[PDB]
């Protein structure tokens with residue numbers, strides 16, 4: 001509040017940014033990650049356009065915005081825009097200076113080494129940050145319950161991560177990185193809607209798909225039995241009068257797209273359903289480690305709020321796997337902020353000093369200081 | 376007034392010229408655009424005829440004037456006359472020299488490139504104008520309210536323009552140019568009056584039609600129901616004793632001509648009603664741009680003062696278009712001077728320097744200097 | 751009018767914040783300045799402004815529609831408030847007041863340039879109207895933001911121990927030669943006559959219009975001694 005530097009809490013993704021004040025429990029400001037141009041010519045004088053529009057400002061008025069996506073899994077097409085995206089967060093809402101308080105960020109597993117240094121360069125050189133750190137998504141969602149033995153699966157808009165982090169981290173391969181989350185779901189629906197004629201073309205209405213999705217759409221329990229149910233017009237035909245003015249009866253369209261999750265064959269890949277990858281992370285570890293893993297499976301990420309996402313797991317996991325222990329998956333109810341809950345902790349830890357980076361530490365060991373010492 | 380060059384304000388059309396002093400809010404002198412000959416022989420010695428008669432001078436005494444129309448949408452049959460039309464404005468009334476003050480004009484969208492240079496040649500070469508500019512009709516009517524997101528429809532005597540200028544200008548096609556305004560309405564009535572016997576032949580009485588029109592004539596709400604009303608002689612038979620001496624009971628003649636507006640089929644064209652062209656400019660732009668366009672539709676031009684012009688729009692627009700947002704059309708009460716209000720602004724802007732043309736700038740980039748750099 | 755306050759703000763930061771003597775939050779990374787506010791540096795200190803009501807309060811535009819009404823009324827005062835047309839302000843009437851006020855300030859400057867003004871500046875003792883109490887901070891601030899002590903180093907010239915010419919005159923009259931009522935009248939020639947007859951280099955001293963300037967105290971001893979070893 002006043003005494004002691006007091007550090008902030010943040011969690012940037014490739015779709016939605018989570019950031020609030022300091023010493024909080026949950027994000028206070030969650031603005032969308034969008035920045036486009038006025039392909040059109042702004043009125044050009046009815047402001048020197050520039051500002052691609054962002055925050056609640058851009059999301060409020062997409063219409064005349066060519067939403068340009070800067071961060072696509074790993075590669076950032078342009079860093080120049082990111083500079084003015086962070087110049088809005090700490091000031092326009094939080095009304096606090098980073099040249100005063102530390103900073104905490106999230107680490108996207110297996111991200112180019114050059115990126116973690118490019119970011120830090122923006123802080124240390126310009127925003128003068130004597131103290132900060134970048135922790136690993138999943139591991140944060142962990143330290144917030146009451147046990148030191150659980151497997152975590154954290155994901156949202158970036159990429160899927162099957163991290164069996166319970167007793168320790170990193171041994172053979174176990175962990176997995178799969179580019180198939182959030183943004184991928186928003187991109188797949190528009191393609192499949194073309195079969196019925198509906199074709200949300202431009203990237204502006206592309207977002208409307210995501211907005212509509214998180215209100216009615218659900219996951220197919222069993223596509224076979226649900227297909228025969230199509231004969232009826234009660235559980236299928238769903239009402240959603242476009243705020244514009246044209247109803248879209250999303251009946252067989254709701255539980256069609258999610259099927260891709262279990263069937264990556266529909267997106268040109270050999271990756272199997274998420275219940276096979278589960279085995280892929282269990283078969284690698286020791287033999288006397290499984291019985292307790294099934295007894296605890298952490299499922300974090302707001303993506304896992306789709307009706308029919310948890311009940312399916314018990315059907316496929318119990319099939320081709322040992323079946324004499326307690327099969328149990330911990331899917332936190334509000335599992336989207338599970339990372340934010342753990343974030344507020346690291347920022348307050350004192351042992352954190354053993355891990356974080358100090359101003360001088362960045363110059364002594366060079367830019368690689370971060371991931372050259374830690375993991 | 377005295378210090379600082381002080382620029383004038385003007386707005387020339389193809390029917391009525393709007394011009395006043397400097398730093399004003401509204402036009403001070405609005406003389407009609409007419410210039411004919413004395414087909415007759417002037418008295419020939421009771422002045423060396425010449426002067427085709429113009430200004431309040433010609434309009435006062437049409438009788439012996441073969442009103443010759445110089446400017447017909449795009450093509451100017453003769454430029455020689457225009458020279459002595461502008462030699463009257465700045466001097467005979469304003470009593471100020473253009474060889475001292477800048478000048479502002481209006482731009483008729485999609486006008487031959489050769490015309491914009493021919494005019495400037497008259498100023499720079501003879502009237503020595505080191506500073507002037509020619510702005511775009513509709514865009515001026517905009518910058519004069521309190522928002523940067525509205526669609527404008529500006530027109531008068533020239534041609535109709537459906538310009539959805541709100542956030543920016545020019546992208547695919549959206550905007551439309553339709554030769555059907557003012558002069559077109561004055562030309563159509565005389566043709567339809569021939570069915571009753573009345574035939575205002577010569578071009579002199581042709582103007583009388585326009586004069587009589589703007590006093591009683593109105594637009595049909597629904598031609599079907601109004602036709603059955605003809606049985607009665609109260610709302611139909613309108614009194615207007617010709618200043619000459621012969622009453623013309625304009626009953627079913629008042630709401631007959633305006634029907635052409637919504638039905639261009641009566642003037643040999645495939646163009647649909649003005650409520651279809653509205654869709655034509657909305658369907659092109661993005662999807663998430665519509666909901667706010669309906670919430671704001673600017674209707675400028677004194678032509679939109681005919682009783683029964685605004686209430687019809689709500690009937691046809693809400694029909695074949697999305698219907699879940701706020702349908703709202705801004706039809707400024709005195710919307711004829713909406714361009715003049717915006718004109719007085721540009722002439723006073725300082726950023727205007729970034730746009731206007733300087734004496735030397737016309738010689739460095741040649742005649743095309745204007746529309747070769749700007750838009 | 752379609753450029754409210756937020757859009758208007760952007761027409762300032764871009765136009766300036768590059769021209770010297772004007773800051774804000776963006777360029778000068780200071781949290782004290784809001785994202786909607788800016789930092790305007792005067793010839794004194796720093797001031798930050800808000801935006802509430804900017805337009806309607808600043809426009810001032812007064813067309814001839816609200817003015818003419820009262821003029822056409824029937825009352826010995828209503829039309830009387832509008833006195834004999836054109837009092838020291840005529841030219842042409844119909845025009846936005848935005849320019850009218852601009853003329854008001856220009857009528858203040860132009861008439862002050864070509865003349866012989868006289869300067870009077872006052873300072874307030876205290877905010878409690880007390881006769882004896884001096885507020886150090888407040889008074890010191892007034893002497894600061896007015897830049898008066900700077901003139902003491904500029905209007906003068908700037909250094910350590912300072913003395914006048916007029917007041918220095920009636921004090922060391924009987925110590926110099928040819929500096930008696932028989933003076934020629936020319937100061938520049940008088941001052942030179944004061945030093946040249948005692949053999950002193952030109953650059954060693956510095957002479958403006960008023961106030962004599964000798965750097966460092968020790969030089970005063972140098973003068974006192976120079977006069978001692980020239981004539982016993």
Ligand SMILES: Nc1ncnc2c1ncn2[C@@H]1O[C@H](COP(=O)(O)OP(=O)(O)O)[C@@H](O)[C@H]1O
Pocket residue numbers: 013014015016017155156157158182183210213214301302303305306336
């Ligand atoms: N109530 C909800 N139900 C289902 N999905 C939701 C809900 N709220 C948000 N989402 C979805 O969660 C995703 C964003 O989750 P988030 O944890 O912020 O992702 P990331 O951090 O990967 O950007 C979006 O796909 C969004 O549609």
Ligand SMILES: Nc1ncnc2c1ncn2[C@@H]1O[C@H](COP(=O)(O)OP(=O)(O)O)[C@@H](O)[C@H]1O
Pocket residue numbers: 388389390391392530531532533557558585588589676677678680681711
């Ligand atoms: N009070 C009025 N009611 C309806 N129409 C009017 C009125 N006054 C003028 N008009 C019409 O407006 C048109 C002229 O408008 P204007 O804006 O000057 O056109 P333009 O600039 O295209 O020459 C003429 O058709 C005239 O009859």
Ligand SMILES: [Ca+2]
Pocket residue numbers: 013137154155156157158159
């Ligand atoms: Ca994620």
Ligand SMILES: [Ca+2]
Pocket residue numbers: 388512529530531532533534
């Ligand atoms: Ca026009």
